[PDB]
């Protein structure tokens, strides 16, 4: 529910269009559109509620792949790099620096 309007039009212009377009146009006079489809708040709510439902349903199981990845990395380390730790940009640099200085 928007019109060409301008970039300065407020959100309440959307409510004004929700009234004028649908009370004036065939969208309600001929029942082409349902009232709950007129409301953009219903789009917002339908997205939000099902969004958090999908969150609660699916996000939890992402731990299985996280654990599998950690297991694979630690397995490669144990098999080949038992001395390997969180040897990120800082730790390897420090060890190389100390060896160089020595």
């Amino acid at each position: 529910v928007t019109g060409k309007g301008n970039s300065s039009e407020s959100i309440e212009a959307i409510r004004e269009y929700e009234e004028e377009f649908f009370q004036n146009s065939k969208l309600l006079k001929t029942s082409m559109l349902k009232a709950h489809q007129v409301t953009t708040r219903n789009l917002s709510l339908a997205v939000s509620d099902c969004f958090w439902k999908m969150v609660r349903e699916s996000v939890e199981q992402q731990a299985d792949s996280f654990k599998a990845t950690r297991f694979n990395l630690e397995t490669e380390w144990k098999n080949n790099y038992p001395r390997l730790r969180e040897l990120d940009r800082n730790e390897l640099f420090e060890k190389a620096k100390n060896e160089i200085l020595d």
């Binding site: 609660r56 349903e57 699916s58 939890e60 199981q61 654990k67």
Partner: protein, 52 residues
Amino acid sequence: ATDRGSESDKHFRKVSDKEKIDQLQEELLHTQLKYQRILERLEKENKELRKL
């Protein structure tokens, strides 16, 4: 550890458990179990002889 069945069994068991708690079974916990109350009520309705 090398060429040992025990390590393969441990790896298989860990992966199997991770799959058992994966998304395949997670969905069923939110789509099937919550209607077991309705199933139990329908079982109670079925055992009653009123319908028969």
